[PDB]
Homo-oligomer: A and B are copies of this chain.
């Protein structure tokens, strides 16, 4: 089970060595590193963890070497994060290398793989190292960010849920037809089941399936009604 972790890291380095433009190896690494983490590190004091940051100096050569990068620098920056996982700042720099070296195919596959880790444990956005600095830095948050059903599930992935609902707000502020408003509330109901609060949401679905059978939407758009009714239990 930790012999498997290695097997992935060996295969990840062999896929990358044979094709640095191809990110499918670069991803396999993030899994061998992050798929063992089943829950965040513990905190307490204003959200701080029992794990120190990247030793002050070690960051600086990297930062210095970025204006003059080669294939070497990156192979040393990738190593660092197989050992320092919550150093998300690293991924920002590990990506800025693929940019200049012309492997943009990997520059986004890194942001996209990190986004799939922060989204699976959204508490990490909040957490900070023992010295105080945040797992996710102001600079690194901006790095991961550029119908309405799709406009919120993406925002539910880039930011947490408090931004997925803050979005849903200003959207409804301009919504005349009720059909549109009701569909907007069907978002809030899926956005909770997506977030994992099946019970609270199942209760919008109960009160939404009754508000539709009152309006008589079974004689017009009954597919909406038959799903809301299975979505109540």
A: residues with CB less than 8 A from B are: 4, 7-8, 11, 14-15, 19, 22-25, 27-28, 30-31, 35, 37-39, 44, 57, 60-61, 63-64, 67, 105, 113, 116, 122, 138, 160-162, 165-166, 168-170, 172-173, 176-179, 181-182, 184-185, 188, 192, 195-200, 203-204, 207, 211, 215-217, 219-223
Known contacts A172-B199, A182-B220, A217-B220, A38 near B22 by CB under 8 Å? no
12 A-B contact pairs sorted by A residue (CB < 8 Å): A22-B31, A24-B27, A24-B113, A38-B61, A39-B64, A67-B196, A122-B162, A162-B195, A165-B195, A176-B223, A179-B220, A184-B200
A215–B216 Cα distance when bound, in Å, is 7
The smallest beta-carbon distance between A231 and chain B, in angstroms, is 14
Interchain CB contact (< 8 A) of A31 among B15, B30, B64: B15
B residues within 8 A CB of A198? 169
Residue with the highest number of chain B CB atoms closer than 10 Å, among A37, A165, A179, A200: A200
B residues within 8 A CB of A200? 165, 168-169, 172-173, 184, 188
